Structure 1
Amino acid sequence: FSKPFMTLGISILYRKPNGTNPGVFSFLNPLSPDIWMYVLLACLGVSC
């Protein structure tokens, strides 16, 4: 061989995992969808 014109290295080629976006109703996520009902049935209940 001659003396190298480019430096190498064995590495791993693999797909990027998809960065699924936090869609614009993202702020409803910290409570479960039944708890949002249970709060809504509370404020419709306790007010009654």
Structure 2
Amino acid sequence: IAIAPLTITLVREEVIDFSKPFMSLGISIMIKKPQKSKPGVFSFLDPLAY
């Protein structure tokens, strides 16, 4: 028996049996986390230039 995070596909069904899905998933999109922390001091004089 094989128990693993295995995707169920037709070609995989066509050769062996899969149980009912215990976990439903979809395609995901992974990007970075761009973090721009709000300045405390310089954010005051921020807009034009010092």
TM-score for both structures, normalised by structure 2: 0.47
Larger helix proportion of the pair:
1
User: Whose RCO is larger (CA < 8 A, sep 6+)?
Assistant: 2
Q: Which has the larger radius of gyration?
A: 1
